[PDB]
Design a protein around this nucleic acid. Structure first.
Lengths: 224, 95, 195, 76, 28, 72, 149, 129
RNA sequence: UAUGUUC
RNA sequence: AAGUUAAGGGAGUGAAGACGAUCAGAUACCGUCGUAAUCUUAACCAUAAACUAUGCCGACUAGGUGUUGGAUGAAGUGCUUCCUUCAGUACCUUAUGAGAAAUCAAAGUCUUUGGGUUCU
RNA sequence: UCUGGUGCCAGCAGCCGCGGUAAUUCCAGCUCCAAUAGCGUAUAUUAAAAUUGUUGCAGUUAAAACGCUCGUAGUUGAAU
């Protein structure tokens, strides 16, 4: 909205020198601010919105000398439903601030997921193009490509996260203690992130390295 | 849950080690596990040295030392303060 | 060429400490019969110039930072930064300045220069949270984690460090159009040295 | 880069191409002018052809030979 | 930080070992 | 959808949140040896940099590009 | 290792050159006669090869002539009815039993004798699966002392 | 006891390009591992390997392209009919779009796709993707 | 390096 | 190891037992004594936190400090050290390796799940 | 977290639990939910169970490496 300039990437996005998010994904730059989505995914002048929801609230206690010091840990799942997903956790004394912090951290952890076609280039991608496994704690989750006519056959949390990721077709298989929602969600998110890190034969061709935003806009921020 | 990597002793490539006996309580303790202190002490303190050297003869008398070489069990060593409990991270450090 | 070689043969950069390490085998020529290794310096020279060719590629030099936690590296890094366009930080490194965006100093660069990875491993560690390439003045025993351009040289000697940074700056200035290659210099290594 | 390796002499036996470390030599005692074949890492005791003398002492290694004489490889 | 360190700054500003020898002679 | 870049050392593609992978730019020179506008670029993966063989990988890559001839 | 521990990779590695060494102008017209005379004088083929390598300078009898030493011994009819290694194992077992009879308290010797007899039985089974040993060969432990023959 | 030679070969290959060493030495060569390597070559997963033919069941040096996700053997060599190719494929390979399940068939070493196109499925050897 | 229970 | 059988041995220690203490009690811890046992021989018994709580064989994957036994090459003084290597044996660090974690160079190379085999 | 009655009783509750005066859990009324001419209950069985594991489990510490070695049957076996 009306922030005071802080960082080079944040200002560069504020001035709008970067057109998309794929370039910062390509250069693996860390995203440090919500300001990078404030002037990126506004409710107006945008193609698709970002959907937020709270998947779990955990009362968590410390057991001090006097009492317990109970706080609340909020898990939220962000996702456009088109190939971008994120998971966020935040612990705070009050559920409201925990939720807000979790939303901020999920937006910060927003990642691209390689949605993969399975039938034809003409059809849009509908499933994971791969058997991808994610692990966190004890729970291991496996996502398997499915034909187009399937829904997400998985646990409710698996459905909720894969819908946010944009995958409309998948077989799931879980082992371990999936009762722990935090580890379950983290494993699902780990598999989704791993989708884009596999080196499928179609990515064997070498490509030229386009300039990173920093050197391409170094002169832009020079007078400041 | 396996407090120490070495199991509290220094046995490797070995099946059995003959035990020795604690100098303080007489407990049987494996030699590789017992806490050994080789004490090379003076027969007397400095004041008694200053007394008997001047009360002695040869005008150059040097008092003999006492070589003790005691060994203690874990309980006796801990109680007599030869070893401390130490912290988990500091537990690894030997010298 | 010959004059440049004569201008650095007289120093003590040849000598590298013990603890040969494993990834400096290529750079070490042999261990002396006394027990102290010696650097080729014939690898040091082009490591210097390629480090300079990747430093000069940064469009604005203020986007490159140089660190040093040693008393006799502090003067060298500050004067190197002043003579080039870079901005350096010497002495104590606050351990959040590369990843914490709230602290008033921050100053995340595009390239990092390290005098000794052992002494300022904190900066080398934080570079791996922000994609900073890192050039390091590695010694015969220095670790090579999260460093890409190893410069085989001495990190203990005050004269070694001062000459190291001085000829680094001289070569980056040569790569710039500031002065031609052939002309002799007017800045003395003792000026870069530590008092 | 293990194909064109060259300085694998200090590498232990059964390197990339397993070759024995032993060899065969011809020995000539001074003032004796005799020719005979000998095996490095010999296990027995050998005697000269012209004049019966001691040549090598069989030990766990490459033997000790004699104080003088000239021994040369038979490799071509 | 004041105007006293600048004057002091201005005041302050103003064969070989055989293995190295054979190394250098090998190099040229 | 985008095409993630690939490490020039191990041909392993670099995910979106490595933050350890780096881009290296080496500048060319003219006849007099002065830096010119054009450059050339590399890409080194975070796992190589963490292992510490990044220096050797860059030496090999620069040799292949004929940037310098000291080999190792 | 068959029993106990220890890999012990110590061995001898033949040279790459399969053929007769060039420096050996010696003719194979009498090397077989040399080994035959040595065996007649009484030597097991292992020590025949060792003596040939040391005192005769003719390594790899197989390289000098395209036929191996125990094979030429068999072709000439000199080869013993019991193979070398099995006979050595039998001799070791006989010595161990002779010692044990005096010292029945040597539990370690008893254990190693069991091990040696296990090896004897395995290798004899192999040798009689081949036709190198009569089908009724058994190695009873009573007359093995004279079975060496 | 090595038992299977190709299993050790493929495990060494896998460890090698997980380390990204770009060149690996396989000590016990054999004709089966040679044909497996040529099939990997023709599918483009490895470079130009060269077999060091010494007099002692020689070795192989294979160049890696950092291009194989996983190569492995399947032991025992289950005999598969042409009918159960699909059942093996959906259980072994990561997708129906890439990856190869290697069979030994009456007409030689081949992958599942060409085994289908040529009929006559045989015994399973391994896979790589 | 006396002993010294229970809720 | 204890235990059993039969001879021998029998110092010291010492299940039992006997006293003396302590204690509310104390048949215990402490002290004095003391039988069996401990030792040897010849037989049984076949069990231990018999424990690295980690079956055996094979391949691969990383740096360093040692140390035990050989072998290789060279050098301060016929004699000592350094280099390489094999086979043991530990330790330190490191993991974009594993694990629930403690931790592990194997407990790694496992949903990218199949080297062989036994037991539970 | 609707209204009465009961008040560790009566009772409910597959499991966790509710009930000692404000019972969102008993006994009732109202309302709501689910499936619907069908809906509960009991027992058995399958999936869930990768908690019988060939695919596909686990065995340092959660249960679980025989005290150790030899060894037959069995299983498995270098390259050409």
């Amino acid at each position: 909205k009306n922030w005071v300039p802080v960082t080079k990437l944040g200002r560069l996005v504020k001035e709008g020198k970067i057109v998309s998010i794929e370039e910062i994904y390509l250069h693996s730059l860390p995203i440090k601010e919500y300001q990078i989505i404030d002037y990126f995914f506004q409710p107006n002048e945008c193609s698709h919105p970002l959907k937020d929801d709270v998947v779990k609230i955990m009362p968590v206690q410390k057991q001090t000398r006097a009492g317990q010091r109970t706080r609340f840990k909020a898990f939220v799942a962000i996702g456009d439903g088109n190939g971008h997903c994120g998971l966020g956790v935040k612990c705070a004394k009050e559920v409201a601030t925990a939720i807000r912090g979790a939303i901020i951290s999920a937006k910060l952890s927003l990642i691209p997921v390689r949605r993969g076609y399975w039938g034809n280039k003409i059809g849009d991608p509908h499933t994971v193009p791969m058997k991808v496994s994610g692990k966190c704690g004890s729970v291991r989750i496996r996502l398997v490509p499915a034909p187009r006519g399937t829904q997400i056959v998985g646990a409710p949390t698996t459905k909720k996260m894969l819908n946010f990721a944009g995958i409309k077709d998948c077989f799931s298989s879980s082992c371990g203690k999936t009762k722990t929602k935090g580890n379950f969600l983290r494993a699902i998110f780990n598999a989704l992130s791993k989708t884009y890190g596999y080196l499928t034969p179609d990515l064997w061709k070498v490509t030229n390295f386009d300039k990173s935003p920093y050197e391409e806009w170094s002169d832009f921020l020079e007078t400041y | 849950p396996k407090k120490r990597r070495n199991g509290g002793r220094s046995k490797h490539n070995r099946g059995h080690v003959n035990p020795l006996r604690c100098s303080n309580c007489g407990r049987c303790v494996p030699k590789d596990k017992a806490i050994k202190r080789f004490n090379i002490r003076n027969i007397v303190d400095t004041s008694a040295q200053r007394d008997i050297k001047e009360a002695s003869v040869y005008s150059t008398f040097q008092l003999p030392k006492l070589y003790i070489k005691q060994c203690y069990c874990v309980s006796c060593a801990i109680h007599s303060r030869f070893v401390r409990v130490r912290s988990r991270e500091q537990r690894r450090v030997r010298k | 060429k010959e004059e440049s070689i004569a201008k650095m043969l007289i120093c003590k950069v040849h000598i590298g400490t013990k603890n040969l390490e494993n990834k400096m085998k290529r750079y070490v020529y042999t261990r002396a019969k006394d027990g102290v290794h010696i650097i080729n310096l014939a690898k040091t020279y082009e490591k210097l110039q390629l480090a300079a060719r990747i430093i000069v590629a940064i469009s604005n030099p203020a986007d490159v930072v140089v660190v040093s936690a040693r008393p006799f590296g502090s003067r060298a890094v500050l004067k190197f930064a002043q003579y080039t366009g870079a901005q350096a930080i010497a002495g104590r490194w606050t351990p959040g300045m590369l990843t914490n965006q709230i602290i008033q100093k921050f100053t995340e660069p595009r390239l990092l220069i390290v005098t000794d990875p052992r002494t300022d491993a904190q900066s080398v560690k934080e570079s791996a949270y922000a994609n900073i390439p890192v050039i390091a003045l590695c010694d015969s025993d220095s670790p090579l984690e999260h460093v890409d351009i190893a410069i085989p040289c001495n990190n203990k000697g005050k004269e070694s460090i001062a000459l190291m940074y001085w000829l680094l700056a001289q070569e980056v200035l040569y790569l710039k159009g500031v002065i031609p290659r052939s002309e002799p210099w007017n800045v003395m290594v003792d000026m870069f040295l530590w008092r | 880069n293990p194909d064109p390796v060259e300085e694998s002499k200090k590498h232990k036996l059964k390197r990339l191409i397993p070759t024995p470390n032993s060899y065969f030599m011809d020995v000539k005692c001074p003032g004796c002018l005799q020719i005979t074949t000998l095996f490095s890492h010999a296990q027995n005791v050998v005697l000269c052809g012209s004049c019966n003398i001691m040549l090598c002492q069989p030990t766990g290694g490459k033997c000790k030979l004699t104080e003088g004489c000239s021994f040369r490889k038979k490799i071509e | 930080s004041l105007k006293l360190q600048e004057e002091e700054r201005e005041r302050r500003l103003d064969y070989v070992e055989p293995d190295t020898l054979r190394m250098i002679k090998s190099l040229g | 959808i985008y095409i993630p870049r690939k490490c020039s050392a191990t041909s392993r593609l670099i995910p979106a949140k490595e933050h350890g992978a780096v881009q290296i730019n080496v500048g060319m020179v003219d006849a007099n040896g002065v830096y010119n506008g054009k450059t050339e670029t590399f890409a080194i993966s975070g796992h190589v940099r963490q292992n510490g063989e990044s220096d050797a990988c860059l030496n090999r890559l620069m040799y292949e590009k004929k940037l310098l001839s000291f080999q190792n | 290792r068959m029993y106990g521990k220890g890999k012990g990779i110590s061995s001898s590695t033949l040279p790459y050159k399969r053929k007769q060494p060039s420096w050996l102008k010696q003719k194979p017209s009498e090397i077989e006669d040399a080994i035959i005379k040595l065996a007649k004088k009484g030597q097991t083929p292992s020590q025949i090869g060792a003596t040939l390598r040391d005192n005769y300078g003719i390594p790899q009898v197989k390289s000098v002539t395209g036929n191996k030493i125990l094979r030429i011994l068999r072709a000439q009819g000199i080869a013993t009815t019991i193979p070398e290694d099995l006979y050595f194992l039998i001799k070791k077992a006989v010595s161990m039993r002779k010692h044990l009879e005096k010292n029945k308290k040597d539990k370690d010797c008893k254990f190693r004798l069991i091990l040696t007899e296990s090896k004897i039985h395995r290798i004899s089974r192999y040798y009689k699966r081949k036709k190198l040993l009569p089908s009724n060969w058994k190695y009873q432990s009573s007359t093995a002392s004279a079975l060496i023959a | 006891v090595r038992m299977s030679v190709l299993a050790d070969c493929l495990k060494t290959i896998n460890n090698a390009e997980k380390r990204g060493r770009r060149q690996v030495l396989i000590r016990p060569s054999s004709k089966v591992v040679i044909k497996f390597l040529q099939y990997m070559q023709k599918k483009g997963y490895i470079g130009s390997f060269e077999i060091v033919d010494d007099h002692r069941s020689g070795k192989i040096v294979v160049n890696l392209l950092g291009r194989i996700n996983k190569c492995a053997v399947i032991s025992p060599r289950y005999d598969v009919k042409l009918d159960e190719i699909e059942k093996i494929i959906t259980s072994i390979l990561p997708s129906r779009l890439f990856g190869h399940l290697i069979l030994t068939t009456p007409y030689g070493i081949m992958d599942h796709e060409e085994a289908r196109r040529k009929h006559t499925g045989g015994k399973v050897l391994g896979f790589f993707f």
